[PDB]
Amino acid sequence: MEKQNIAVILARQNSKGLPLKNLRKMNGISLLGHTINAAISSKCFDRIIVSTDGGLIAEEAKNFGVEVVLRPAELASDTASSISGVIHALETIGSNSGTVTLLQPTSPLRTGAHIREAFSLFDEKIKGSVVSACPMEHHPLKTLLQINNGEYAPMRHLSDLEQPRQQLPQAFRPNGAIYINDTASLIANNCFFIAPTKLYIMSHQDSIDIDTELDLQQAENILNH
Amino acid sequence: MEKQNIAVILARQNSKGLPLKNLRKMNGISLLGHTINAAISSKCFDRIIVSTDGGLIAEEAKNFGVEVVLRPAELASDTASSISGVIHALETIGSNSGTVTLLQPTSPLRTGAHIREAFSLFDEKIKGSVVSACPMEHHPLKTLLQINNGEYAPMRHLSDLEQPRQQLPQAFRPNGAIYINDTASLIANNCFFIAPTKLYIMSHQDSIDIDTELDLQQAENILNH
Ligand SMILES: Nc1ccn([C@@H]2O[C@H](COP(=O)(O)O)[C@@H](O)[C@H]2O)c(=O)n1
Ligand SMILES: Nc1ccn([C@@H]2O[C@H](COP(=O)(O)O)[C@@H](O)[C@H]2O)c(=O)n1
Ligand SMILES: CC(=O)N[C@H]1[C@H]([C@H](O)[C@H](O)CO)OC(C(=O)O)=C[C@@H]1O
Ligand SMILES: CC(=O)N[C@H]1[C@H]([C@H](O)[C@H](O)CO)OC(C(=O)O)=C[C@@H]1O
Ligand SMILES: [Cl-]
Ligand SMILES: [Cl-]
């Protein structure tokens, strides 16, 4: 079968952090709508699929002119991985060759231009992932993790907690906005991070993601500049 | 010798991100001044020492009515650990018994009330650290580190990158604001994290730290409410 560049936007309906998160408006347009417009305007995709369990989400997808894949509940639950949804979408439309890009609606400031730029890093021959990421304001080695009840362990070393920032390995946060992969490689590896992975750097600002009403407010302030 | 509760504020002059960072004003008062007022108003300390390599910083300390220790350049360079400075300050004033608290000027929204609350977690008998910390907006396991080669490795597992947030261990960032220790234990362990460590939780908002002009702007917005 022929190579196709698919955009898959996973957008479950019953979001727990904030009700109907993927439909929440930000400057008059839904989170879903922002990512769809970004996919459309990027002009990188032969097909744009929104995958959802919910008719409210499906209905919004249709009004933006894009295809919809209906997910069974097990693939939309709070424990479901993104990979299982994207694979399910690929199986439904019958694509296993070309490129598949995950575009999460939680990243409203990611634009068509970002998608274009990310694509120019993707290499048809080598077929490693392109993943959008931003540098971090606070180094993740300088953290404690809960191990039992009332015990906290350092991420790696106790000494790392007190290391001058610059002595530590450079750290990047994948921001959720863009994950580009060779489709067959995605299917084979069953993950979004495939060697050799290139990072597409976005500003911490443009990497804002929505968990809360505040995040939404703040993204709106950012957009208006 | 008698037990004394020392506050040590390490405040180097030649800050290499943001020029003269520790003297930067935020609502009319320097970062240094904010942490000094917090120490003074907490009423937890017998002595308050500002340790610096620089006369501008020393001068500001004197105007707030607190003691100054002059650090030799080697203890104020970008590679110097905070511990070496605090120990040096303890040796200078001749305290090795009681409690020593590190208060970093980069945490302007940490107040005397925070210090007081942190102190009520400290146990004279058990003598483990109290360290101020806040929960994280983004999980540090979901990160990549530069390994020397050109290539990015996951913090822990590749699978962690795609895990739903809630499946991951709870994460806390020590925020730099408060580190309380038994003085002799600090000296013995030569670090700020001494078992059994208690965490003093602050909001992410109150845990804001200053690396940039924006951080300073943002702290100013926060304070005015
Ligand atoms: N299994 C999953 C996981 C995430 N998602 C969606 O992808 C985005 C990422 O959400 P998280 O940051 O919760 O993974 C959200 O828009 C969320 O609704 C989904 O639709 N199905
Ligand atoms: N050796 C050191 C390390 C940090 N500092 C100060 O401690 C605070 C913490 O800075 P970092 O977060 O960069 O270590 C800053 O105010 C910095 O100027 C210092 O005065 N001497
Ligand atoms: C007590 C301590 O940890 N001091 C360290 C401090 C701290 O880790 C950070 O301020 C946490 O926010 O930061 C840095 C740094 O250059 O980044 C150097 C200090 O040696
Ligand atoms: C591709 C991927 O990793 N998707 C995951 C996503 C991501 O890690 C984060 O949104 C990046 O910022 O988050 C979560 C989550 O419940 O938090 C689950 C998704 O399966
Ligand atoms: Cl969600
Ligand atoms: Cl500094």
From Swiss-Prot, chains A, B:
* GO CC entries: cytoplasm
Q: Which molecular function term from Gene Ontology is one that the record holds?
A: N-acylneuraminate cytidylyltransferase activity
- Which Pfam families has this protein been placed in? CTP_transf_3 (PF02348)
What InterPro entries would the database entry show? Answer: CMP-NeuNAc_synthase, Cytidylyl_trans, Nucleotide-diphossugar_trans
The catalysed reaction is:
an N-acylneuraminate + CTP = a CMP-N-acyl-beta-neuraminate + diphosphate
Task: Enumerate the subcellular locations listed in this protein's record, separating them with semicolons.
Answer: Cytoplasm
Q: Which domain of life is it from?
A: Bacteria
Q: Does the keyword RNA-binding apply?
A: no
Entry keyword annotation includes RNA-binding: no
Q: Which CDD domains match?
A: CMP-NeuAc_Synthase
Per the UniProt entry, the Enzyme Commission number(s) are: 2.7.7.43
**What SUPFAM superfamilies does the annotation carry?**
Nucleotide-diphospho-sugar transferases
Q: Which UniProt keywords apply?
A: Cytoplasm, Nucleotidyltransferase, Transferase
In the record, the note on similarity to other proteins reads: Belongs to the CMP-NeuNAc synthase family.
Protein name, entry field: N-acylneuraminate cytidylyltransferase
Give the organism the record lists: Neisseria meningitidis
Gene encoding the protein: neuA
